[PDB]
């Protein structure tokens, strides 16, 4: 009768424990919020699996627990509701009969068949005679009314048991997809080209491309145990923490099955932060060779072809404020296809404009505003010349480029 049920729950648990550390938790826990001003809590739907392997299903075989009377917790501001199921006795009688017991019994008799003695209890009560599972947290209003804590998440048997977590997970996948395509676009178009310079672009793309298919399948069918999702989420956080200086390795939360609020929300926001921080050096330094009053810079770099905005770093014996009024007028850039020591005709489409910022305290920075034909002639000829007259004084030039995307 009851003897067969117990062992077959143990058989299924022993099998679940081969692949999962915690095969127990909530699948569904729904409540009637309408009676909370009247200090009464009722469950509407409960699909909960107890740590001993016992699955409770209100929709199938089980009866909803009796109403939770909140009159007993008038002195409290927070109450943690748990679903309780009496512990099965190996030596004793697990059925409610006439005789009184010092402990609750697992079953009651109905119609005749066995029915579980499910009740709603609170975490501040003595519950060691019961198998317990968190099912909600009630917190009070400014008015002092009981209301279910929106931030609450119970131990999960399925990801689907937490719709909020589900939302943040879909959000994380969208953020990851966006950052992966952006990084796939900024990849060196050789024939595929990888070198010693961009370890960040490779290892960040290897991290994202390896994780994406794996996390997408875990989220397409979100009805498996969260231990699977955690492992793959933590694997990604770890891969991403290699290029982080603001976040330490200790930042990856350990798996606390009983308190998923301290594991999935911190891990998802850490991942979100790591994904926003995932921006390799988009600055290309162009070396400027000085041949008297001329400055020559080579534009051989493949990344400049894609689209980039140029800036000028200028240091001179000329005073700071007097340099911004003279440099855009005096300094005229040279034609890339042409070779000389002085530029008599400045290029069509080039306009040096002084800027606040793109470190050097005495340096004055200016934006190198270029047109469709001006940037074309420079990149096609793979060179850019600059003429700085003797009137500018002991002038030094450095060319910087910021790659678009």
């Amino acid at each position: 009768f009851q003897q067969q049920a117990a062992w077959d729950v143990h058989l299924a648990d022993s099998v679940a424990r081969m692949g999962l550390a915690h095969p127990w938790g909530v699948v569904a826990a729904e409540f009637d919020d309408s009676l909370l001003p009247l200090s009464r809590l009722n469950a509407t739907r409960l699909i909960v699996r107890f740590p001993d392997g016992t699955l409770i299903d209100t929709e199938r075989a089980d009866n909803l627990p009796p109403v939770c009377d909140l009159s007993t917790v008038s002195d409290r501001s927070l109450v943690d509701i748990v679903l309780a199921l009496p512990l099965l006795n190996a030596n004793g009688g697990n059925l409610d009969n006439g005789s009184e017991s010092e402990r609750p019994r697992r079953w009651k008799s109905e119609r005749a068949v066995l029915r579980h003695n499910l009740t709603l209890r609170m975490a501040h009560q003595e519950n060691a005679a019961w198998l317990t599972c968190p099912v909600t947290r009630l917190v009070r209003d400014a008015q002092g009314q009981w209301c279910r804590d929106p931030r609450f998440i119970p131990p999960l048997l399925t990801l689907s048991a937490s719709p909020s977590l589900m939302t943040e997970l879909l959000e994380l996948l969208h953020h990851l997809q966006a950052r992966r395509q952006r990084l796939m676009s900024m990849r060196r178009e050789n024939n595929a080209d990888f070198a010693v310079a961009d370890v960040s672009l490779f290892w960040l793309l290897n991290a994202l491309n390896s994780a994406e298919p794996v996390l997408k399948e875990l989220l397409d069918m979100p009805y498996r145990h969260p231990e699977l999702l955690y492992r793959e989420l933590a694997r990604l956080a770890g891969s991403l923490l290699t290029f982080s200086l603001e976040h330490n390795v200790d930042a990856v939360p350990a798996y606390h099955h009983e308190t998923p609020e301290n594991v999935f929300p911190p891990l998802l926001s850490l991942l979100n932060r790591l994904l926003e921080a995932s921006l390799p050096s988009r600055v290309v330094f162009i070396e400027l060779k000085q041949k008297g009053v001329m400055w020559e810079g080579a534009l051989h770099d493949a990344r400049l072809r894609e689209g980039a905005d140029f800036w000028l770093s200028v240091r001179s014996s000329m005073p700071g404020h007097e340099l911004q009024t003279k440099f855009p007028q005096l300094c005229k850039a040279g034609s890339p296809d042409d070779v000389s020591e002085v530029v008599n005709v400045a290029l069509s489409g080039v306009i040096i404009r002084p800027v606040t910022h793109v470190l050097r305290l005495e340096n004055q920075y200016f934006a190198l505003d270029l047109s469709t034909d001006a940037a074309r002639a420079m990149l096609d000829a793979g060179r850019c010349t600059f003429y700085t007259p003797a009137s500018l004084g002991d002038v030094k030039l450095e060319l910087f480029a910021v790659l678009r995307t």
Partner: nanobody
Framework: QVQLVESGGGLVQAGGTLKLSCAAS????????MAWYRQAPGKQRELVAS???????NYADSVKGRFTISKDNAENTLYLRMNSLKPEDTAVYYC?????????????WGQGTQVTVSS
Amino acid sequence: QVQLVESGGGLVQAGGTLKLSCAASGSISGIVVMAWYRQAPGKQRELVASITSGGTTNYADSVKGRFTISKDNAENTLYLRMNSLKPEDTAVYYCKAFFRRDYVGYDYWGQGTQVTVSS
């Protein structure tokens, strides 16, 4: 596993007193609740009083207001102070231990101690 030994039983006149003791040893950290049971001649074993590991007491209606269950955690001893004794309290008293070795419950018993209440 838990081991229990009762002592303190005997003969008393009606209105008298007895203090039963129950020495507990073993994996005491797993005890959820301790109780006192009693078996009268033709009658079956009935619950007398219980005490949870947190100290919550409960008594049968027949002994409520007369008996006191208490625990000495230091000496791992369960006590039953039986005051205002009545001849109807004559029975063999057993101490019980309800133990938990996750996630299953187990019952442990004492040998029994005879309590006779004369008039």
